[PDB]
Amino acid sequence: MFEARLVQGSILKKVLEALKDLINEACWDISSSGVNLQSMDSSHVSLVQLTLRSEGFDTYRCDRNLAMGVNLTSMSKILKCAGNEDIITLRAEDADTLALVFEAPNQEKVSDYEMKLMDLDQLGIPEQEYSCVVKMPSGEFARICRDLSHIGDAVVISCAKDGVKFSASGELGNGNIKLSQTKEEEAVTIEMNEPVQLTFALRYLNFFTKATPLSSTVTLSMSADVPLVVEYKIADMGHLKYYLAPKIE
Amino acid sequence: MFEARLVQGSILKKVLEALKDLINEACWDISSSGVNLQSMDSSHVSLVQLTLRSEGFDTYRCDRNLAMGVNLTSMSKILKCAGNEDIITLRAEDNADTLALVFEAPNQEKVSDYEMKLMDLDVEQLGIPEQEYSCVVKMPSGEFARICRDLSHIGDAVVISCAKDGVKFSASGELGNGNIKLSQTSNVKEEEAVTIEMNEPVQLTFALRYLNFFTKATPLSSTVTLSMSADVPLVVEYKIADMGHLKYYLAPKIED
Amino acid sequence: MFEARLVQGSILKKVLEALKDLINEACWDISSSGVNLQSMDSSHVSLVQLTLRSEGFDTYRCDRNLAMGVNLTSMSKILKCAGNEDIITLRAEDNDTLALVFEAPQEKVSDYEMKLMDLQLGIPEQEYSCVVKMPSGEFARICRDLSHIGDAVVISCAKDGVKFSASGELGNGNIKLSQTSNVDKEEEAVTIEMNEPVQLTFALRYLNFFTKATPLSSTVTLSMSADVPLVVEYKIADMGHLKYYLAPKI
């Protein structure tokens, strides 16, 4: 038996809203340490990695390590029935279904759902040092990608110790954004150690941006010929990293 | 002459946005106590019963009982030219084939004057047995609508069940099941509260497609009443103001 | 070099919004006294008449009086990328392209650039039978509502009264607007200076276009006389105005 309790139900709500259109099916991998999800997107370009930790949950227990294939879209549906202040409570029974329990606080309302669960079959993500690491705000990164998605299909991200520039070009013109190294946690911090210039796909960056309601900031980690890492930290919980290789032939 | 003056024009706006995709064309029965409307839905499944009483009108005049057939879509489209705070006046002539809607704007700045084509509708008076139900549940408007759409994504049907300690709503479907439980409230101001009075535990199944229709009457009241007994239709009731009410009748699905 | 600077970029965004749906390609006629535009729409039916006087800009430069062929829809997709308190500056250098630079209010700095292109007429001054001043949103809601009733609005003006009418398959409507009186609050008041009474009939789809400029002013004026086009006027703060011209129907 596995029964984890999360006071911050909105966190689950937001995770699933993020991933629901990115992947359709994913193997949540339940452990003594916490929850882990590693997957490639349906078109097998980007790579998602979610980590939630025992310590984050109000209550956590896991007597057998589980490997649940879940339909992201169906879980999205079931969680959408939860208020953004409910105490979601996940539970299984070494397992054919996944039980969810929403508990709206300060109201005698209690919801109790069971999701049909899938048979699904990992992958490698080597923690490595990155040439440059921008910690900017989530809203601004979102904004920037949204806007440049109307000029071109791809984005050119250039970095150095003075600031970060994001560029794009299409049939309908040319465009540049220039952010400068900058107080209240709403500032840019480039810690670049090497001349990093990389091109990525705005479709998939915009897919990444949906985790924005999870963090006020977002870090972008990158080096030559190495998949970009967009990470949104969750809280006490771990993180929701996104990996995208730049386009080269 | 028929002439009725409603200060809260929003009442009529909301009544007709509630009854629009359900009923495509109804027959309003105007008389001395007020306006009544009573109609099957276009799929002949649910029954709608609106009652606006003469007392809620600032000015109520009816010289001759009317059965004026209105295309509810055209009425909604005309009432969408009325303002949330507009005083709305209904006027028809005794020998009239049109209904004149007249919207007075708050500071007398503007007055709108619309005229809507009537039509002849041959409609029988579907009877409505006056029953006493096994249990009645008072509960917030929005909370009910919230349960009813949420379960609409898990199943297409909703099993309501009633006992002295609260009321439960359940559904099943091709991705699992769900079950929402509400308890009788004591304290909750007080518009928000889930009270029940019961004579007998009931457990009935209803199509969610139609309950969601009904929940489009929510703007009308911060509460809703569910009335239930075995082998008799569910009644979902919204009081308008201390003026009348909108009632929906849905029939359960058969018992194994 | 043309270089014009505006601290309320919101105003240009609103202009491109108030124009992108009538014209696709326009010719900014830019000179020392301000920027101008006076174009017919895609169906040669309506007339649009943009005027940003240079004294309204915070930094205005014009070395020569140029005609910039500008795809308004592409200009608008670019203008979408700027913020509402943003600080927008246009530049055209020696000859060829248009540049749009948005200074975030913040550490952001945006540099967009679009291609120009290789694409007039006369509008005379006039003393109209009827001038009606009203709140922009009110006239907007009138056109919005009456569009759901019919495809043509009869606007008839007389003393103590302006009256909008329409009719269609489901019925007919007639909205009567009165001149506000002993409370003269200026931008929520209606005012009818009525030289000689008039009836005119206009297509509501074009008026409904014009109302897209509604966010530019809290008032609007309607100038109108027999057998001559109606002038819908949205005075852009205090640097110019925007003007729509529509003759009666059939």
CA dist., res. C31 & res. A12, Å (int): 58
Q: How far is B166 from chain A (nearest CA, A)?
A: 10
- Could you tell me which chain B residue has the CA closest to the CA of A106? B188
Give the strands of the sheet with C198-203, arranged side by side: B59-62, B2-6, B87-92, B98-104, B110-117, C171-177, C161-168, C152-158, C198-203
Question: Taking chain B, what is the end-to-end CA distance rounded to the nearest angstrom?
Answer: 54
Dihedral in degrees, nearest 10, Cα atoms A218, A224, A225, A230: 0
Find all residues with CB under 8 Å of B42, minimum gap 6, and list them.
Answer: B22, B23, B24
Indicate the residue of A74, A109, A114 with minimum beta-carbon distance to B177.
A114
Structure-block tokens of residue A114:
């069971």
**Smallest Cα–Cα separation from A156: which of A192, A193, A200?**
A200
3-class DSSP state of A54:
helix
Resolution (A): 2.8
| Full strand arrangement of the beta sheet holding A173-180 | A196-201, A154-160, A163-170, A173-180, C108-114, C98-103, C87-92, C2-6, C59-62
Chains that contact B by 3+ CB pairs under 8 Å? A, C
CB contact under 8 A, B175 and A115: yes
Strand, helix or coil at B14? Answer: helix
Q: What is the DSSP string of A105-139?
A: TTTTEEEEEEEE-B------------SEEEEEEHH
**Chain A hits for B176, Cβ within 8 Å:** 74, 78, 97, 113-116
Residue type for position A169: S
CB A37 within 8 A of CB A28: yes
List b or e across C13-38, with b for residues whose CB sees 16 or more CB atoms inside 10 angstroms: bbbbbbbbebbeebbbbbeeebbbbb
Angle at the Cα of C150 from the Cα atoms of C146 and C154, rounded to 5 degrees: 70
Both tokens of A243, joined, read 């990996």
Separation in Å, CA B151 to CA A74, A82, B133: 13, 11, 25
Q: Are C147 and C208 in contact (CB under 8 A)?
A: yes
In the block, residue with structure tokens 């909105």: A10
Report which of C123, C126, C133, C165 is spatially closest to residue C232, judged by C-alpha positions. C133
The count of domains in chain C is 1
Angstrom distance (rounded) from CA A49 to CA A27: 11
Asked if B154 and A111 come within 8 Å (Cβ–Cβ), the reply is: no
Neighbours of chain A (3+ CB pairs under 8 A): B, C
Cβ contact (<8 Å) for A174 and C110?
no
> Is the distance from CB of A214 to CB of A142 less than 8 angstroms?
no
Q: How close A105 gets to chain C, by Cα (Å)?
A: 38
Question: What range does the domain containing B137 cover?
Answer: 1-255
CATH number at residue C61: 3.70.10.10
Q: How far is A90 from chain C (nearest CA, A)?
A: 42
Q: Are the CB atoms for B82 and B47 separated by under 8 Å?
A: no
Report which of B130, B111, B118 is spatially closest to residue B94, judged by C-alpha positions: B118
| DSSP count for chain B of H helices, then E strands | 4, 18
Of A108, A112, A115, the CB nearest to B183: A108
| SS3 call for B145 | helix
Residue A230 C-alpha, separation from nearest chain B C-alpha, in angstroms: 32
Alpha carbon distance B86, C175 (integer Å): 13
What DSSP element (H or E) covers B176? strand B176-182
φ, ψ of residue B97 in degrees (nearest 5): -105, 5
Contact C3, C90 (CB under 8 A): yes
Contact flag B71-C178 (C-beta cutoff 8 Å): no
Q: Determine which of B156, B158, B175 to mutate to test the interface with A (most A C-beta atoms within 10 Å).
A: B175
Q: How far apart are CA C54 and CA C36, in angstroms?
A: 10
CA distance A72 to A91: 17
What does the angle CA C206 – CA C212 – CA C217 come to, to the nearest 5 degrees?
Answer: 120
Which residues of chain C neighbour B80 with C-beta distances below 8 Å?
A: 145, 148
**Chain C environment of B78 (Cβ under 8 Å):** 149, 170-171, 173
Angle at A79 between CA A77 and CA A85, to 5 degrees: 145
Nearest chain B residue to C188, by CA: B109
- Strands B203-207, B195-198: parallel, antiparallel or unpaired by DSSP? unpaired
Shortest Cα distance from C129 to chain A (angstroms)? 45
- Are the Cβ atoms of A177 and C74 closer than 8 angstroms? no
The residues, any chain, with a CB within 8 Å of residue A238's CB and separated by 6 or more, are A34, A50, A51, A52, A53, A56
Q: Which residues of C touch B85 (CB under 8 A)?
A: none
**Taking a C-beta distance cutoff of 8 angstroms, is the pair C133, C194 a contact?**
no
Q: How far apart are CA B116 and CA C167, in angstroms?
A: 10
Question: What is the SS3 string spanning chain C?
Answer: CEEEEECCCHHHHHHHHHHCCCCCEEEEEEECCEEEEEEECCCCCCEEEEEEEHHHCCEEEECCCEEEEEEHHHHHHHHCCCCCCCEEEEEECCCCCEEEEEECCCCEEEEEEECCCCCCCCCCCCCCCEEEEEEHHHHHHHHHHHHCCCCEEEEEEECCEEEEEEEECCEEEEEEECCCCCCCCCCCCCEEEECCCEEEEEEHHHHHHHHHHHHHCCEEEEEECCCCCEEEEECCCCCEEEEEEECCCC
